[PDB]
Amino acid sequence: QVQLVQSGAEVKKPGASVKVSCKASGYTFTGYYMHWVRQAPGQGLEWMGWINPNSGGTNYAQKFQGRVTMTRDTSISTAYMELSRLRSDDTAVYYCARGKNCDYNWDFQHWGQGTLVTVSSASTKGPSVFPLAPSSKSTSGGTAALGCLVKDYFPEPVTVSWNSGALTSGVHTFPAVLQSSGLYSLSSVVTVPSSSLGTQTYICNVNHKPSNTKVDKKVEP
């Protein structure tokens, strides 16, 4: 089985440059071109260029000429993409991809897992976690809603669980919104029977790996 394994998430300031790698296995590395395609958050797909690992030959999309550089190291079966003079609209998930066939090589049967690159002038910061307490104003029938507000963190992502992952039913963790401050904010809610508010404890667990931040918040009425 073919595997494309990419390097980890990156965070960059405008003007900086970024280099992402893709290691290929399960096939003859030099036998196929490697492509790079990016996807901005909430948007579609854009091809950036290909490299022929057998020769080092490349073909870059017109818009990236003079900004992008693709290389490879045949000996570790690895392709690289370097993108310079970054701007905030370079914020995207970058994918390496391999075509299915050779004479027409554009059917991408194989994709890496993607590398998120966040471009921003903000600095890394752990979230503040605030309880969204259940009350009569968050109750319909014998059902109540409670949750957590995970506010002012950078960069993405954060993971949110409830009772360490023991509670999954009725949980909704919302996509982060990027605020005008340049920091992200998100909420996670859960609906539970209102009768259980006095007996079952609900804790929200927020993990923000980029700042090694972990936070347990008890949400009570």
């Binding site: 797909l45 999309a61 968050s138 319909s140 919302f174």
Partner: protein, 206 residues
């Protein structure tokens, strides 16, 4: 080559047949790939050479067409088939068709949360309105403070369509300073959705 996909959004019930169109402006070619992308995942190749099924792709997926017009057909929709679909020729991709599951209308359960004491201690006040488990996706949330309409001080987010019950949920956050928050009394979110005969208002007194 510009690839125009149609429709932008397609909403159908499971069991039904889906047909997606891709038009390729300057193509005299018979090559075309289609991809399915689900939330949080890389795209997955479905069809290549216009009509060949890629690895592990079920028989209900079929493709046809050439030159300028192409079609992707899903014979009888399984709920796992619902996602964003892209076509591609050479380096160019279409904009994407969002295929969502059509279901019966469900009105939002609406909840409202005042700011926590802990945030208030930090000088800020976020009020949150939750619209839980509703369909269709179209929903309007308006924030009213002492009956006055707010704009530009709220942000909202919506979950992906739930894989079990095909509903959506929406979270809207209105954010003020503590000082401004205490200058007013009644905080309210007004929800408009086709499942509601009239706009629903959930509110509280600071």
């Amino acid at each position: 080559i510009v690839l125009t996909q149609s429709p932008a959004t397609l909403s159908l019930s499971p069991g039904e047949r889906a047909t997606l169109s891709c038009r390729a402006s300057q193509s005299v070619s018979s090559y075309l790939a289609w991809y399915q992308q689900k939330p949080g995942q890389a795209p997955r190749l479905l069809i290549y050479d216009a009509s060949n099924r890629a690895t592990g792709i079920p028989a209900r997926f079929s493709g046809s067409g050439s030159g300028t017009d192409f079609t992707l057909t899903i014979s009888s929709l399984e709920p796992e088939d619902f996602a964003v679909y892209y076509c591609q020729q050479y380096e160019f991709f279409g904009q994407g068709t969002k295929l969502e599951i059509k279901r019966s209308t469900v009105a939002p359960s609406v909840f409202i949360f005042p700011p926590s004491d802990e945030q208030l201690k930090s000088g800020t006040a976020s009020v949150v309105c939750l619209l839980n488990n509703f369909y269709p996706r179209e929903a309007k949330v308006q924030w009213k403070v002492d009956n006055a309409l707010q704009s530009g001080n709220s942000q909202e987010s919506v979950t992906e369509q739930d894989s079990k019950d095909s509903t959506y949920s929406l979270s809207s956050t209105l954010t003020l300073s503590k000082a401004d928050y205490e200058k007013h009394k009644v905080y309210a979110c007004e929800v408009t959705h086709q499942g509601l005969s009239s706009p629903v208002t959930k509110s509280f007194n600071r």
